[PDB]
From a paper:
Schistosoma mansoni Venus Kinase Receptors 1 and 2 (SmVKR1 and SmVKR2) are important for parasite growth and egg production, and are potential targets for combating schistosomiasis. VKR proteins form homo- and heterodimers, a key requirement for VKR activation. The intracellular kinase domain of VKRs shares 41% sequence identity with that of insulin receptors (IRs).
To support our drug discovery approach, we determined for the first time a crystal structure of the SmVKR2KD at 3.0 Å resolution in the presence of ADP. SmVKR2 adopts a canonical bilobal kinase fold with an ADP molecule bound in the cleft between the two lobes. A novel feature of the SmVKR2KD is the presence of an extended helix at the N-terminal lobe, which we termed α0. The SmVKR2KD was crystallized as a dimer with the interface being stabilized by interactions between the N-lobe from one protomer and the C-lobe of the opposite protomer, related by a 2-fold symmetry. Although the crystals were grown in the presence of ATP-γ-S, the electron density maps only corresponded to the ADP moiety and not the thiophosphate group. As the crystals took over one month to grow, we believe that the ATP-γ-S was slowly hydrolyzed during crystallization and that we captured the posthydrolysis state of the kinase. Based on the conformation and orientation of the hydrophobic spine, the αC-in DFG-in conformation, and the E1014 and D1118 pointing toward the ATP-binding site, the SmVKR2KD has adopted an active-like conformation. In the SmVKR2KD, the loop is confined within the C-lobe reminiscent of active kinases, whereas in inactive kinases, it extends toward the N-lobe.
Author numbering: 943 to 1126, 1142 to 1257
The structure:
């Protein structure tokens, strides 16, 4: 064998993180993740219990899949930040599958969050969940969490409202690192220098961050809604219609419209050199993130 040894040498380094299956119990079906279902329950860190969600993949798939499964956890262990989801352990060979244990975010992801609290914005626009005081702090938490990733020479390459989870504290954190690589497909969240060229940088992550901001101020619309995935690879290269054109007419004079337009510029020499240029903006204008909606909900 030549691919069945990679698994058993990898778990040697991740051996201090193994937990017996008698310390993990499954209660809920939290959601349908990318590769398998995620379950919700409680895990005991040999001392006390904590509410936890688990990513699970059965032991029937190829070893090629199990290596990527454990590589997500190995990368996740190198992180510690109040705006990044932190794992607490793994579990090797429990009965039918392999377990990935990561803390529970009570209020789910951000896209389903906004999609469910849409009419609440049209009827109660000053609510503790969805007011510019909270939306700006949320986008700010995502920003400094991505700045923490970039600080330690990491590129996420997949910034969207699907990979940002919110907890009962209503603080948001970075969620999915399935596509995260080292420092030097979601095409709608990718700058053109990363689409036709396959090169990723901090500026490509800033492009996806600006797309996330458009996704937030619209409460979850599908970027470039109405254009197929084949029409967008040709339209974004020749600088026609930045994402700002897809906004309601209530924008195009605001501070958030310009911001996502500077974060999403074809000339990456004009894009911010670091996430801290964007973060320092979110302090001079603390009510920039506003809900800009229509009377017709978005159609996925
Ligand atoms: N720790 C968690 N807390 C709450 N929900 C989660 C958690 N982990 C995963 N999920 C749910 O499972 C899916 C995320 O799994 P993943 O494969 O990481 O997909 P994504 O690309 O959305 O991050 C989402 O639907 C999300 O709502």
């Amino acid at each position: 064998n030549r691919t069945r040894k990679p698994f058993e040498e990898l778990c040697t380094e991740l051996a201090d993180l193994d937990m017996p299956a008698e310390n993990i119990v499954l209660n809920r079906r939290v959601g349908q993740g990318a590769f398998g279902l995620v379950f919700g329950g409680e895990a005991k860190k040999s001392d006390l219990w904590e509410a936890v969600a688990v990513k699970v993949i059965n032991e029937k798939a190829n070893y090629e899949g199990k290596i990527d499964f454990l590589s997500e956890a190995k990368l996740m262990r190198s992180l510690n930040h109040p705006n990044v989801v932190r794992l607490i352990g793994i579990s090797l060979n429990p009965k039918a599958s392999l377990y990935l244990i990561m803390e529970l975010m009570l209020l789910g992801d951000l896209k389903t969050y906004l999609l469910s609290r849409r009419i609440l914005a049209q009827r109660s626009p000053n609510h503790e969940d969805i007011r510019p005081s909270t939306l700006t702090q949320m986008s700010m938490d995502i920003g400094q969490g991505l700045a923490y990733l970039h600080s330690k020479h990491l590129i996420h390459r997949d910034i969207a409202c699907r990979n940002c989870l919110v907890a009962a504290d209503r603080t948001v954190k970075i969620g999915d690192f399935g596509l995260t690589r080292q420092a030097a497909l979601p095409i709608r969240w990718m700058s053109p220098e990363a689409v036709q060229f396959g090169v990723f940088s901090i500026q490509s992550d800033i492009w996806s961050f600006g797309i996330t901001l458009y996704e937030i101020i619209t409460f979850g619309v599908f970027p470039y809604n109405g254009l197929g995935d084949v029409e967008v690879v040709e339209r974004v290269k020749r600088m026609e219609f930045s994402i700002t054109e897809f906004l309601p007419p209530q924008a195009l004079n605001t501070v958030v419209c310009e911001l996502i337009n500077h974060c999403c510029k074809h000339q990456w020499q004009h894009r911010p050199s670091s996430m801290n240029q964007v973060l320092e903006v979110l302090i001079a204008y603390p009510d920039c993130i506003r809900p800009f909606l229509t009377d017709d909900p978005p159609k996925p």
